[PDB]
């Protein structure tokens, strides 16, 4: 299961020169990596959730996992995004 290739490709295209190109195989590779990223973080968030005596993995569980697994730089941007999403 992957995020739509078109969505992935659009973000990829915005990160390279206007005339740069991306091989189909590379888009599929990033698709694979994104799902692996979500699974990696989710596994740790699930453990955290369980240790906190809960069953529904929440935002704090996800952010704890990101900070614990080496993605702490994602935390502040994510908090701002979620705040704007729900305001």
């Amino acid at each position: 299961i992957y995020l739509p290739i078109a969505n992935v490709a659009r973000i990829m295209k915005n990160a390279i020169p206007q005339t740069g190109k991306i091989a189909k195989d590379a888009k599929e590779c990033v698709q694979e990596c994104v799902s692996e990223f979500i699974s990696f973080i989710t596994s740790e968030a699930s453990e955290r959730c369980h240790q906190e005596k809960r069953k529904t993995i929440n935002g704090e569980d996800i952010l704890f996992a990101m900070s614990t697994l080496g993605f702490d730089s994602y935390v502040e941007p994510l908090k701002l995004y979620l705040q704007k999403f729900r305001e």
């Binding site: 299961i1 994104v34 995004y81």
Partner: protein
């Protein structure tokens, strides 16, 4: 990004049955940040090879140069 798809990906893990409504929202933004950094880093090798097309081997190379991507080493090996 469609949130239902993100939720489906999370649930591929058999032990994940209940997910907060906010978790997929956080992942939608996280996915954008991740794809951007991963692509930018792969492109470093695309340019080093004087190519204009980003390839899987560029991604595999990028993965070996960033500690944050250690989890992908066996997923996209050089």
């Amino acid at each position: 990004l469609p949130l239902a798809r993100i939720k489906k990906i999370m649930k591929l893990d058999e032990d994940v049955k209940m997910i907060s409504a906010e978790a997929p929202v956080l992942f939608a933004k996280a996915a954008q940040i991740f794809i951007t950094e991963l692509t930018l880093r792969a492109w470093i090798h695309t340019e080093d090879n004087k190519r204009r097309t980003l390839q899987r081997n560029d991604i595999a190379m990028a993965i070996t140069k960033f500690d944050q991507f250690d989890f992908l080493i066996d997923i996209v090996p050089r």
